[PDB]
């Protein structure tokens, strides 16, 4: 078949504070969320990216009851929780798809 997961494959372009632009995946993004910045040419693109990130954080907090703290990369037990349900973030799958019908 065709395999493409949000976490496994690099699809978010960011820029680090050291001046190096890069494209990374979802698992690397929230692992180092305190050392980079989202960089999108169209402002609506980065606004919707931030909104989806906030909604995902809200769901994971609702299912882990951990409140994020400032200056931390992210609260612990969020990356393993997102790895628990990695099949849900599927694109070009067979029966399970993300944001599709």
């Amino acid at each position: 078949h065709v395999m493409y997961n949000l976490l496994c494959d690099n699809w978010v372009n960011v820029v680090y504070l050291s001046g190096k632009p890069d494209r990374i995946s979802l698992v690397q993004t929230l692992k180092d969320a305190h050392c980079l910045q989202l960089a999108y040419s169209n402002p609506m693109d980065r606004f919707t990216v931030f909104r989806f990130l906030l909604a995902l954080g809200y769901w994971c907090f609702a299912n882990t009851n951990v409140e994020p703290e400032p200056d931390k990369p992210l609260p612990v037990s969020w990356i393993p929780w997102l790895e628990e349900n990695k099949e849900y973030f599927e694109l070009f799958g067979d029966g399970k798809r993300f944001f599709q019908a």
């Binding site: 820029v15 504070l17 050291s18 001046g19 632009p21 910045q37 960089a39 040419s41």
Partner: protein, 97 residues
């Protein structure tokens, strides 16, 4: 700093925009640095990447010296009013006489 005419108004401050500079002491981007999307990669399917941008200022007289314009700007017809007192005309008149 070139000028163009005599009463050309001038600014006391010259703002300048500069690319950020690495060096591993301030390896992280400073607080007063904005982000510009002007790092070119490709042109036909145009591709641009972010670049950190810093701002500074300059003052005329201490860093840049004000220059002066060259040539003549305002054009006027010659229209020389005749004079009957200088030596050259006084000799030309006698030569004609």
């Amino acid at each position: 700093l070139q000028k163009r005419w005599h009463n050309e108004p001038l600014p006391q401050i010259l703002p300048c925009v500069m690319d950020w500079i690495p060096g591993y002491d301030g390896e992280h981007a400073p607080d007063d640095a904005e982000i510009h999307y002007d790092l070119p990669v490709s042109f036909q399917p145009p591709r641009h990447l972010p670049r950190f941008v810093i701002r500074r200022e300059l003052v005329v007289g201490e860093d840049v010296q004000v220059s002066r314009e060259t040539g003549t700007s305002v054009w006027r017809p010659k229209g020389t009013r005749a004079d009957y007192n200088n030596s050259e005309y006084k000799k030309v008149r006698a030569e004609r006489l």
